[PDB]
Amino acid sequence: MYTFVVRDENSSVYAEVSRLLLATGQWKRLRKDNPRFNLMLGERNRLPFGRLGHEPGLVQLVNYYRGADKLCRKASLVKLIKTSPELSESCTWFPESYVIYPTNLTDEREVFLAAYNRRREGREGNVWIAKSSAGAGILISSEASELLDFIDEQGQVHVIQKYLEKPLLLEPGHRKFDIRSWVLVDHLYNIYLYREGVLRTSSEPYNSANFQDKTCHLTNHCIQKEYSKNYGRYEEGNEMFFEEFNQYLMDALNTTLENSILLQIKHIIRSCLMCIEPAISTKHLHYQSFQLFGFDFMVDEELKVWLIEVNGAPACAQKLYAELCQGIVDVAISSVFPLAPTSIFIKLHHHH
Amino acid sequence: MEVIELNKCTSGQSFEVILKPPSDPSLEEIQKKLEAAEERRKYQEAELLKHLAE
Amino acid sequence: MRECISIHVGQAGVQIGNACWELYCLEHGIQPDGQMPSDKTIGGGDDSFNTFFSETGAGKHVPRAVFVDLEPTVIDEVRTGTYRQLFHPEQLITGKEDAANNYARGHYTIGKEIIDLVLDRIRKLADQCTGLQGFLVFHSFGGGTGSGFTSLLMERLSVDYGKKSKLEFSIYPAPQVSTAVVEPYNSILTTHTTLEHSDCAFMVDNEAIYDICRRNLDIERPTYTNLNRLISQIVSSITASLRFDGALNVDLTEFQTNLVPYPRIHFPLATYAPVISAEKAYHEQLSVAEITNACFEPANQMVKCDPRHGKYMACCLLYRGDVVPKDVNAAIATIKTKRSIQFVDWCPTGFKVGINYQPPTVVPGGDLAKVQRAVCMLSNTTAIAEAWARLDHKFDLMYAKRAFVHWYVGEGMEEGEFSEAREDMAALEKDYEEVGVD
Amino acid sequence: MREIVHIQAGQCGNQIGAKFWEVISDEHGIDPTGSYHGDSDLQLERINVYYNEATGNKYVPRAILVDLEPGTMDSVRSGPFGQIFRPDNFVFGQSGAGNNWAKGHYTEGAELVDSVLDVVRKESESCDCLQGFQLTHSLGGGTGSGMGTLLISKIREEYPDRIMNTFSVMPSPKVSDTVVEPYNATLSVHQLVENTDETYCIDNEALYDICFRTLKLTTPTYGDLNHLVSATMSGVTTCLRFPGQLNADLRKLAVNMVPFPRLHFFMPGFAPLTSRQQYRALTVPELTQQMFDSKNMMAACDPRHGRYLTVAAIFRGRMSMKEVDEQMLNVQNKNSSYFVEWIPNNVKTAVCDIPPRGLKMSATFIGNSTAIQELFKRISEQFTAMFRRKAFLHWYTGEGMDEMEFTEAESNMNDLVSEYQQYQD
Numbered sequence A: 001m002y003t004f005v006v007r008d009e010n011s012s013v014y015a016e017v018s019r020l021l022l023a024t025g026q027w028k029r030l031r032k033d034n035p036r037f038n039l040m041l042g043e044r045n046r047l048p049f050g051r052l053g054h055e056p057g058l059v060q061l062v063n064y065y066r067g068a069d070k071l072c073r074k075a076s077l078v079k080l081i082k083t084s085p086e087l088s089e090s091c092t093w094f095p096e097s098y099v100i101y102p103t104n105l106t107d108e109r110e111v112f113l114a115a116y117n118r119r120r121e122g123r124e125g126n127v128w129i130a131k132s133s134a135g136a137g138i139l140i141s142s143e144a145s146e147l148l149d150f151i152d153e154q155g156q157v158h159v160i161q162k163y164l165e166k167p168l169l170l171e172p173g174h175r176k177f178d179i180r181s182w183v184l185v186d187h188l189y190n191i192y193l194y195r196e197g198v199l200r201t202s203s204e205p206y207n208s209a210n211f212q213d214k215t216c217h218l219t220n221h222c223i224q225k226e227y228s229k230n231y232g233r234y235e236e237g238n239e240m241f242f243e244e245f246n247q248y249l250m251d252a253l254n255t256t257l258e259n260s261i262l263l264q265i266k267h268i269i270r271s272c273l274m275c276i277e278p279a280i281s282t283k284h285l286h287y288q289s290f291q292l293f294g295f296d297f298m299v300d301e302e303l304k305v306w307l308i309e310v311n312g313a314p315a316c317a318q319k320l321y322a323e324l325c326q327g328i329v330d331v332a333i334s335s336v337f338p339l340a341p342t343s344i345f346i347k348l349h350h351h352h
Numbered sequence B: 001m002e003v004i005e006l007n008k009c010t011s012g013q014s015f016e017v018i019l020k021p022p023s024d025p026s027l028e029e030i031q032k033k034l035e036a037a038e039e040r041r042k043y044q045e046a047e048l049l050k051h052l053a054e
Numbered sequence C: 001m002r003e004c005i006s007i008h009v010g011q012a013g014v015q016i017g018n019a020c021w022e023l024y025c026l027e028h029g030i031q032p033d034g035q036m037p038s039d040k041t042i043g044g045g046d047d048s049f050n051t052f053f054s055e056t057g058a059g060k061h062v063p064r065a066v067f068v069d070l071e072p073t074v075i076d077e078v079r080t081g082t083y084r085q086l087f088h089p090e091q092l093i094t095g096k097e098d099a100a101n102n103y104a105r106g107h108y109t110i111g112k113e114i115i116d117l118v119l120d121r122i123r124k125l126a127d128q129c130t131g132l133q134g135f136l137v138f139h140s141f142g143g144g145t146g147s148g149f150t151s152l153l154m155e156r157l158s159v160d161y162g163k164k165s166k167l168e169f170s171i172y173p174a175p176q177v178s179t180a181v182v183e184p185y186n187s188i189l190t191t192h193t194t195l196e197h198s199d200c201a202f203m204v205d206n207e208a209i210y211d212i213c214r215r216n217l218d219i220e221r222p223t224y225t226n227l228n229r230l231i232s233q234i235v236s237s238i239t240a241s242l243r244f245d246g247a248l249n250v251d252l253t254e255f256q257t258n259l260v261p262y263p264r265i266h267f268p269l270a271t272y273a274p275v276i277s278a279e280k281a282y283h284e285q286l287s288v289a290e291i292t293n294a295c296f297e298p299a300n301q302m303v304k305c306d307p308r309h310g311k312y313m314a315c316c317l318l319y320r321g322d323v324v325p326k327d328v329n330a331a332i333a334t335i336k337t338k339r340s341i342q343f344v345d346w347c348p349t350g351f352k353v354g355i356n357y358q359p360p361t362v363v364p365g366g367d368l369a370k371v372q373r374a375v376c377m378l379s380n381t382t383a384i385a386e387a388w389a390r391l392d393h394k395f396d397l398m399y400a401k402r403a404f405v406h407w408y409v410g411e412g413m414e415e416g417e418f419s420e421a422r423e424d425m426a427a428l429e430k431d432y433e434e435v436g437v438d
Numbered sequence D: 001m002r003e004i005v006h007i008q009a010g011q012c013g014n015q016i017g018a019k020f021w022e023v024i025s026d027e028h029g030i031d032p033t034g035s036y037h038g039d040s041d042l043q044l045e046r047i048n049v050y051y052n053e054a055t056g057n058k059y060v061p062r063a064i065l066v067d068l069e070p071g072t073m074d075s076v077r078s079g080p081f082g083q084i085f086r087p088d089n090f091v092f093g094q095s096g097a098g099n100n101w102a103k104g105h106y107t108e109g110a111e112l113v114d115s116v117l118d119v120v121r122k123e124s125e126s127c128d129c130l131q132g133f134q135l136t137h138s139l140g141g142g143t144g145s146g147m148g149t150l151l152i153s154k155i156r157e158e159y160p161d162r163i164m165n166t167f168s169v170m171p172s173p174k175v176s177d178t179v180v181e182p183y184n185a186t187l188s189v190h191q192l193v194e195n196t197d198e199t200y201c202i203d204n205e206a207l208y209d210i211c212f213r214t215l216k217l218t219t220p221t222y223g224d225l226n227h228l229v230s231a232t233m234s235g236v237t238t239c240l241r242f243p244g245q246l247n248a249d250l251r252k253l254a255v256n257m258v259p260f261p262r263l264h265f266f267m268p269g270f271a272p273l274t275s276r277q278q279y280r281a282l283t284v285p286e287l288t289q290q291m292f293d294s295k296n297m298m299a300a301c302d303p304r305h306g307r308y309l310t311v312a313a314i315f316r317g318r319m320s321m322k323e324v325d326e327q328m329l330n331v332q333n334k335n336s337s338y339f340v341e342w343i344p345n346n347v348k349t350a351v352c353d354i355p356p357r358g359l360k361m362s363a364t365f366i367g368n369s370t371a372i373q374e375l376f377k378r379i380s381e382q383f384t385a386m387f388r389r390k391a392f393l394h395w396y397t398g399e400g401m402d403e404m405e406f407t408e409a410e411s412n413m414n415d416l417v418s419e420y421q422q423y424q425d
């Protein structure tokens, strides 16, 4: 009889895992403060890693890699990419980005204007986007004065990265979109990619002559369901899955999702996770770790994949909660606490 | 990667390697804390005996 | 030359003291009867070993130690043990009933009535020193004597020896080799009243020594003898610079200078390797780069934690055996490129390195195998704060219900000394976070 | 040298105490004459904890036999090991207590208390360093109850900083001598709450249910109930009488078991408990699963009705200490809903190489559980059933007591029930 606890009631993902665990009759749930446990579904912020792995006779497992925030925070990711030789500053799949601190507080303000003036002088597209992790608060503008003046009006760190002025547009509609891939990493650091992805598409025609209205530029699921007037017109819930998106790519462009986008995605996920393995690995640690990730990708009109950000506590698509949650119990939990396919994941082999 | 202050003797040697440059109570007060805890003991034990006398 | 007096308080300190002086004698070629064939100055001399050993006219090399326990059953093992002849009866002080794992008992009730005696016995070894450096105090955190009495002894030593240094060797409490439950109280009580009196403290977590004995020595259930023979190795390696020729860590003062920039953060993390089972057929002798690369694994730290998520303030590498500087610098370079070694911006990113050619001595019949080179890394990391967080959490759980508090109050302690000691730890944890996190 | 002073008062007290000395005497190799004839040095390691070394290598238990009628103690002296006891340590009256707490505590007992303490004092003055006392007695009778508590009240007055342990037999209407046992029990319990550090509760009903159901004894006897107490007393004292890495005296043992001064009432357990399929070897799992089973507990209290404050387990025999940890760690990690979460590591374990007589290996259970409140609920319910009508009060009011003192004992134990209740939630 294995035992676990719950410390994040707001997690729609692991709320299902706990429901499945109790359905097996072999996992008993405990109060949220009982240290005698095998598995911990911990909180998001200020998770007490230091107290894990000190209970005699208990092998403990947690669902958050300590130090993953370096990859899931806006400013941390950029600093990680420009400082990590594995990715280098010339990383071809990550938009040219810069970390900018508000003037009321290192900082890459001057380095940003340097490349900005270089672009304004060379007639090139010079539309940037400002964002941060403390947002739901994003500003798109082609003027460097408005971007910097908007960050100084706040009080937390921000990042200015190139805006993809040539995004891939679906038809019919002429609309933007992004791609969400779920990647699970077990205690052995095997990198499993969920065979099922989702595209959170915009229900508005992309307009390049008006960044003021951010409904055809932002593809978030909550902005389309609040500020968009064509929500649910083309696909149910602005969510297209890998089956239909694969058929469209074959009818219009004469190619497959595997060859055009999936290879780049599997390459980006590898490069990001292998990069920070020696920093977050729990190979010879007194406790074990495994975390679910949510990579958000972009695609331009040249079928080149760019990395937007990585989510450390992502939510899932309503249609994929069952298949994915069960998979988490198969490869991540039961692999360490066995019970008494055609895996739904894609192992991304690598050199540990 | 620099090696400074190399000292060698018969039974070994020691040096320093730099990779990157940077960027009470008196004797009177203790006897009081001890005697004070001894008084609270005597007062607690006295209340125990007074209880037994009743 | 300058002398060092060692003090062993409680069962844990006294047993670990027994295991170290056994090692010191094997290293320095000192027989159980105290004679030293290699010492050519009969009954005198200011050699390096004389920092820990004095000499008599008869040529007996006697430790500069003092064993203190409030119940005699543990010290008696020394009076009749293998090295009974080293010490004289003055150096062994024993009471008649212990502190029942009660800090308030060892500190107040029982400690007051025996403190003046220990001082006198220590004053007798001090008068034999031409230039006393300071004291090495071995004790446990859980034991009522190791915790309650040690803090009191420290307060007085800072009064009778103001300018002298005081290093600690503290045994962190681990449930796998303990039968008590109030150890978090004692640990937090003693760390509060001792903090401003200890210049540098080496914490060993029995849980760490336990798993190193189970994993590397293939002991299914290790005894205190097992734990002590390993802990005495680390201790030997840390005190070697004071007993042998050298220029690194040559006096107790150099330990604070090289390891403790901020005072309240005086708890270096220790790491040791290799630890090889003697029962093994025959092991492949590890290289300098391999054993050094092991110093950054959690599996051989005296306290289980994650230095990757802390920041280093200082770092020492004490080597023993066939090691040359050329090989050391080679391994270090390779490790900086594979590891996460984040220093604090107000401290140099460097390593002081000491090398003693004599390889580690092993007690015949012991559990460790003879290796040609070994190393011990002393690193001041904010990651050791995890050990405090663990302990401070257990303290909160019990104190929220005032559990076991009556046992301390009943021995003369005021309930306020709990919250006063706890708030001090809340300050010690904040100092670690102010220096480590961003 | 950490000596213990044993005391047994009353019929139940002395019969149980006698068998106790019969059990451990055999374990330490002490024959009925006081001569040692064992084969292991571990039998003498801690022999001075319960025995005084006389001349000629004779060992004389450090016990004091007490009672207000000569009957019971005449049996002990003529019994198997009766000669072993010190002739002077027999202190007895002739009137008797008539199963009346008042007589044992105020009138008859009072006249004899000074002479008993004179012997207690004589045994202590020889101790190099006294750990503390232990009294065996029942609470439903008059002597071991009324006088027994009176002794404790006076031993704590002369030795206010020594440990006072008691093995207390609680009355049950299924094994009842007199209808007034709830009176005597309620009065004693208040004394134990005040002047004892540890009290092992031993319900005669649980002893009866164990002999009848688990042991398959058709018609149990007081002697059968005492064999269990004998073996149990031997178990809880194993860590004290034999060597090992334990190094624990009575005070240190209480310090880790009593989180609160008044909640020092334990439930003991023993395993195995087999009926005569008696030669089967018992595995470490079986030893553990029974040790925590209520049917192996002697308080007649369902532990699953409360929560464990602290638990202590002692294992005897040549076994796999690695295997002991696993099974114990298994019981915790499989029933962690019954241990309190505000006391980390409240379950500890000890191993001993010497097993009891005639058993490859055994396990003794010591539990400080809030379930014990169900015991004091029975006693308080039976008390109120009679005191509400003042029934049988005259036996006591005639001895000099007032109804007020009864009302206080009533409210005193109801408080003890409420105290155990606020820690179960």
Ligand SMILES: Nc1nc2c(ncn2[C@@H]2O[C@H](COP(=O)(O)OP(=O)(O)OP(=O)(O)O)[C@@H](O)[C@H]2O)c(=O)[nH]1
Residues within 6 Å of the ligand: C009, C010, C011, C012, C013, C015, C016, C070, C098, C099, C100, C101, C102, C106, C140, C141, C142, C143, C144, C145, C146, C147, C171, C172, C173, C174, C177, C178, C179, C183, C206, C209, C224, C225, C227, C228, C231
């Ligand atoms: N590493 C190691 N730890 C020990 C040793 N002896 C005891 N301990 C630990 O010390 C803690 C208990 O403290 P003790 O040293 O036994 O108590 P004490 O200092 O003698 O003080 P008293 O309570 O009066 O007995 C437990 O957590 C033990 O695990 C030892 O020889 N080696």
Ligand SMILES: Nc1ncnc2c1ncn2[C@@H]1O[C@H](COP(=O)(O)OP(=O)(O)CP(=O)(O)O)[C@@H](O)[C@H]1O
Residues within 6 Å of the ligand: A095, A129, A131, A132, A135, A136, A161, A162, A163, A164, A165, A176, A177, A178, A217, A218, A219, A220, A296, A298, A308, A309, A311
């Ligand atoms: N450099 C860039 N070029 C083009 N579009 C961008 C962009 N950066 C962000 N976006 C748009 O913003 C969205 C992602 O925003 P971002 O991830 O920064 O906020 P967020 O993290 O709160 C959303 P989530 O965490 O749910 O993925 C995408 O849908 C994308 O269309």
Ligand SMILES: Nc1nc2c(ncn2[C@@H]2O[C@H](COP(=O)(O)OP(=O)(O)O)[C@@H](O)[C@H]2O)c(=O)[nH]1
Residues within 6 Å of the ligand: D009, D010, D011, D012, D013, D015, D016, D097, D098, D099, D138, D139, D140, D141, D142, D143, D144, D145, D169, D170, D171, D172, D175, D176, D177, D181, D204, D207, D222, D223, D225, D226
């Ligand atoms: N277990 C056990 N209980 C006993 C024994 N003798 C008496 N009792 C119980 O003790 C109570 C009577 O107390 P008693 O021994 O007569 O007290 P005394 O007057 O001091 O001798 C009743 O509840 C009995 O069930 C015995 O030998 N074994």
Ligand SMILES: CN(c1ccc(C(N)=O)nn1)C1CCC1
Residues within 6 Å of the ligand: C179, D198, D236, D239, D246, D248, D253, D254, D257, D312, D313, D314, D348, D349, D350, D366
């Ligand atoms: C399990 N155990 C205990 C614990 C408590 C008591 C008691 N009589 O209170 N007895 N034995 C031993 C491990 C070292 C002590």
Ligand SMILES: [Ca+2]
Residues within 6 Å of the ligand: C039, C040, C041, C042, C043, C044, C045, C046, C047, C055
């Ligand atoms: Ca000399």
Ligand SMILES: [Ca+2]
Residues within 6 Å of the ligand: B024, C158, C162, C196, C197
């Ligand atoms: Ca000082």
Ligand SMILES: [Ca+2]
Residues within 6 Å of the ligand: D111
């Ligand atoms: Ca009379």
Ligand SMILES: [Mg+2]
Residues within 6 Å of the ligand: A133, A309, A311
């Ligand atoms: Mg986000």
Ligand SMILES: [Mg+2]
Residues within 6 Å of the ligand: C010, C011, C071, C098, C143, C145
């Ligand atoms: Mg001790």
Ligand SMILES: [Mg+2]
Residues within 6 Å of the ligand: D011, D012, D141, D177
């Ligand atoms: Mg009777």
